[PDB]
Amino acid sequence: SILEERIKGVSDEANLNETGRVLAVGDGIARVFGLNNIQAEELVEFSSGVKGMALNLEPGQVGIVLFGSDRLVKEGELVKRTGNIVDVPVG
Amino acid sequence: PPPVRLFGVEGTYATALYQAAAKNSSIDAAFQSLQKVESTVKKNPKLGHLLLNPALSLKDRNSVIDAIVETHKNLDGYVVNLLKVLSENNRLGCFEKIASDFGVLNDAHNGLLKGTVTSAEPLDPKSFKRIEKALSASKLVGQGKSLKLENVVKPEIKGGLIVELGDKTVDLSISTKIQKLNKVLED
């Protein structure tokens, strides 16, 4: 319809499922918006060169913990699900 | 001026909206139009359920606002500016909220006293007319205020019914009486 079409033209599009986008960062913890498929204690990999572990999944938001570095992460970059729990090699 | 203060947060907006629209005597117009422009956001199933909660900047949302008023030109000048205010503070999830409150404020002006007459099961239509008659007769609605009866089915009301409107209620249920009884059993 025309109503949907005027929204579609002025929108960059989003939805935010299986990726999320950061809202604010600092204290060596970050706040990402979305990520409603994540597992509890999963590892996420950021598109900035850093990995973090989700600790608090709150409705409609997630609080990742950044394993070093506060520089790489900035508000508006995309956080992606690795899809596996945090593990370490054993053997 | 506002007539009475109702609602907590996101009612500061609704309050403010009625008192601005009060000076012209066109709140009824403003509110109707708001229902029709809100519904056309909903019948935008993507980006009108997927952009109520913050997800994009203030500015993109503002431009989503500009696009909503260019496609619907009847919205009244108070509600075309209220949207601007909401977009700049960067909120749209409590958009239905100001709308709902603004309806209550408006219908206090119309002089409608909205009411739910929950029952266990849907009652007959005759039972309805008679409740509307009676409730008018009873001093809970002094007259001057036009009651509406809205039927609801709640099988969680286990037997009986509850008549609710304003701050005045008559609870003539079976369900409560059972709960009270069950506790009371000692012998």
Specify the resolution in Å: 7.3
Other C-beta atoms closer than 10 Å to the C-beta of A68 total 10
CA A54 from centre of chain:
9
Six-digit token pair at B87?
């977009």
| Contact (CB, 8 A) for B163 and B170 | yes
| Contact (CB, 8 A) for A16 and B55 | yes
Interchain proximity A4–B50, CB inside 8 Å: no
Q: Which residue, chain included where needed, has tokens 């002094």?
A: B142
Pick among B37, B42, B43, B56 to test the A interface (most A CBs inside 10 A): B56
Ordered by start, the domain boundaries in chain A are 12-84
**CATH T-level assignment (fold) for domain A12-84:** Elongation Factor Tu (Ef-tu); domain 3 (2.40.30)
Other C-beta atoms closer than 10 Å to the C-beta of B6 total 14
Name the residue among A8, A10, A33 with its Cβ closest to that of B63.
A10
How close A89 comes to chain B (CA, Å)? 37
Which residues, including other chains, have CB under 8 Å from residue A25's CB and lie 6 or more apart?
A31, A66, A70, A73, A74, A75
d(CA A51, CA A64): 9
d(CA B171, CA B70): 49
d(CA A26, CA A70): 7
- Give contacts of A15 with chain B, Cβ < 8 Å: 46, 50
Among residues B76, B82, B88, the alpha carbon closest in space to that of B16 is found at B82
Which residues, including other chains, have CB under 8 Å from residue B154's CB and lie 6 or more apart?
B118, B119, B120
d(CA B134, CA B166): 16
Other C-beta atoms closer than 10 Å to the C-beta of A17 total 13
Locate the chain A residue with the closest alpha carbon to B52.
A15
Instruction: Say which amino acid occupies B16.
Output: A
**CATH T-level assignment (fold) for domain B11-110:** Peroxidase; domain 1 (1.10.520)
Interchain proximity A9–B67, CB inside 8 Å: yes
Instruction: Say which amino acid occupies A47.
Output: S
Hey, is the C-beta of B23 within 8 angstroms of any chain A C-beta? no
| Contact (CB, 8 A) for A68 and A30 | no
| Contact (CB, 8 A) for B101 and B11 | yes
Six-digit token pair at A72?
């790489």
